[model samples]
Target: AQNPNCNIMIFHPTKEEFNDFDKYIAYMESQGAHRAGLAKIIPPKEWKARETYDNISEILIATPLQQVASGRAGVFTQYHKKKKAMTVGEYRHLANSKKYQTPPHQNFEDLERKYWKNRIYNSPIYGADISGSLFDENTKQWNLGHLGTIQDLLEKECGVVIEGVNTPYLYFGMWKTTFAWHTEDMDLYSINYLHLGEPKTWYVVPPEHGQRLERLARELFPGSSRGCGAFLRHKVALISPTVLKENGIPFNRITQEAGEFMVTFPYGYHAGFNHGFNCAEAINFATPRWIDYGKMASQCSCGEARVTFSMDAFVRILQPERYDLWKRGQD
Candidate 1:
């Protein structure tokens, strides 16, 4: 739990902490993730809060369609390599107009919210791709380096000086797929915080209901939760809270801005959704983590599942001359 090589921590922010998305984004860019620490007292701010989600930073956050050019292969690969999405301008251009080629399943049209609803899926909003053209209005731009700057801010502003995390990889994100559940993979500990608006429903299967849930995923998505073997995991399903709480498990009902919380995910089975009601969270996980293959196997059956692997292939097959040099600089 306490390894110099592993510096994992999560904190909750009070209502005033995540006052503004723009300010929070700026602070994170300056502080980085592992470097983010909490302070004993809050800072003074004259930035009077907005009354509604409209005033809550009208920013539209999205990953560029071109970025998805990295494709399903790129999706898994980026998951492990810790790459940031292309900047906001790049996303805007791609969304406003189709400037580049796109993968078959990565269609901007297919990812539309309506398409999601038309399916027999429980919620029209389920498995919505926060990428490409028709993404939600306030989705947070997946800034790659935002974590690093968040760490810096935690040190400078919060005075919780910590060492720079030598983490070379990124967090785990799946390719476009149906439902995803709650599960952990790495030995890493995780902390999830909520920064605003109404509380989203968070249900965790009690240890007792664990067996039943595992059976559910295996039945629903074969070989999806295979590596762990019969372990019930939480994918993006609307989990049954009664079963969880009655069994003596904790199911969090998150309400209030800057409502921060954490789960030391042995990198194991955990899952939930983010309603993004003024929500911005910092997920900190150390390396030695594996990407979920079930996500890609279902989408890119013939494709290599690692983002790093595909990125390397892209350089070799697509940009050979720059491959080695680019890799060297990265190292």
Candidate 2:
């Protein structure tokens, strides 16, 4: 009812109209056909009429008009550099083949020794993933999946705005494998509803030119739960997306809702896994953007609120070499 767009009244038939509980459930489910946020609605008024009932209800699922899609690498990275990380992959392949379960509390020293123990850990100047790693004018640096850098970008660049109505939290989930590197994408921000069951380490890396994000993850966040405000915790979880499960791949479904003032940000070198459990979930975002509130160009050319650092940080990381390709819009 608080939503300005909602005006139609839901007419719940009298109980006498529906003979059983299943019938009532079926009727309620029907509402989902037309409403996006029907899941959050509540039944406000109900009248019991002599062995019958009449009602109107609300379900609250703050459905957004625009949603971005996410992609994933395989259990092992498909990128060329990752393939060159001979030590890590060799160890994983050996473990899987030998049926090795890293002993508890003994530290993964044995596994590390088996893989990266003897390998030289140095920055690669060129590799299969080199060009892909470089910043492109089309895909901004901040937008290029640097979860940690994005976090720092948000905190240092963007301004945090509080909502007059709700300070909603955010949630993240899915991905069953334990990765040796990297973090989630720009999707980290734009969330308000936050919840986490298992926690993972987040490493902090200062934003710099010509730096490898994967190497940064390993150096700062190495097996530490510093990511997402959790310490030394492993397996940060988010409500896994069902679509991924069906495909045997992990998926993160982040859900959030906040007022106009909130800023969405996807920050820090972040990563999560579910090695011991079936799933894990958490809420991680950098700068929050109230995109629903819309925007104006004066907010752009005149140093308005539209191009906030958190929002415009992309302008820095995603420095467009060609002005023709990237232009300022309401975004």
Candidate 3:
């Protein structure tokens, strides 16, 4: 029932491909998915390597206790209620213990070993202030040196930082764990790098039809809007490719491999499930192209999904260089 015309582009760039940041950014502006063995940014050894359990234990140990429980560093899981509060020590102990039971399924037993060995799975340490560490190392690799992104430009020009948008977050996933369907904050762009381990499968509705998909989702789950805007709640139902095709909405699938990068453009609704245990890094950034969209997202009545800012203040930071760079592909 899949649409034969539905397709997603995956980029297999070389080390040289990332050398020219501007050129790469320009090319990336068109679509998402770029992989150039970036998993090497975090060595993939069984133990103490960057993305491995040992390294996570070390980082958590070094992190202050306050950060973990202050809505900044928390664990997200599909098996239980997510974003449950716990301390850094508790999180470290959980990862070190490696005692989580597999969900009910026969094949899950086979995958259990691989899943347990990577204990950090399903434990995402968000907004943990990675000032310096392997977590920061991987980010520096793709952040395009000191030349800066629109996110950087805005902060420097406006002297305000967007928490969740400009900051980096780390994720550890196991088989069947999912990031439910949603677009980035303010419909801005996001980059997710699979630092190591098995691939993650992603489904996306293009920007042009994101609203159509949102409407469809609301119609299908009309009860979801319990005083909140559409697609801004805790649960996300997977709308199949066949369903989208039947509805005449465009959709595509991508299986991001280890060491690769996946980019999501403004307003593109994306969802994914992990094939097995893995570690990944993600962050969001915006360009001038997202100005209006950011304003709309700021006004979104969906929980804290809005980006806070004043248009008058925001306009002060809109520079000519930033505007020129933001207008890429539009001209």
**lDDT of the candidates, in the order given:** 0.31, 0.25, 0.49
Task: Give lDDT tens digits, candidate 1, residues 123-195.
Answer: 1111122322211334333222233332343345435444444222211111221223444322223434333
**Candidate number that wins on TM-score, 1 or 3:** 3
TM-score of 3: 0.61
Q: Which stretches of candidate 2 lie over 4 Å from their true place?
A: 1-76, 79-105, 108-176, 180-184, 187-204, 208-267, 271-275, 284-331
Cα misplacement distance, residue 260 of candidate 3 (Å): 0.7
The number of the candidate with the highest lDDT is: 3
In the range 1-331, model 3's lDDT, one tens digit per residue, is 2222334555545565655544665564444322111111222222221344344544442342121111111112222323555444455444334443234345533443343343234443322323322344454336422335555556765577643223556665555555656777545677776766666777787666677877777765565654446444333355545556778766776577676667776677787656655666676666556666665552233443333333223423433333332233112
TM-score of each: 0.35, 0.24, 0.61
- How far residue 39's Cα lies from its native spot in candidate 2, in Å, is 32
**Which regions of candidate 3 fall more than 4 Å away from where they truly are?**
1-6, 30-54, 61-140, 143-151, 155-165, 233-235, 302-331
lDDT of 2: 0.25
Model 2 lDDT at residue 56? 9
- Across residues 161-273, which tens digit of lDDT does each residue of candidate 2 receive? 32211112212211122322322222233211111122222212211210333333234344432332222112222211222244433112111221101112222232323
- Among the numbered candidates, top TM-score falls to 3
Q: How accurate is candidate 3 locally (lDDT)?
A: 0.49
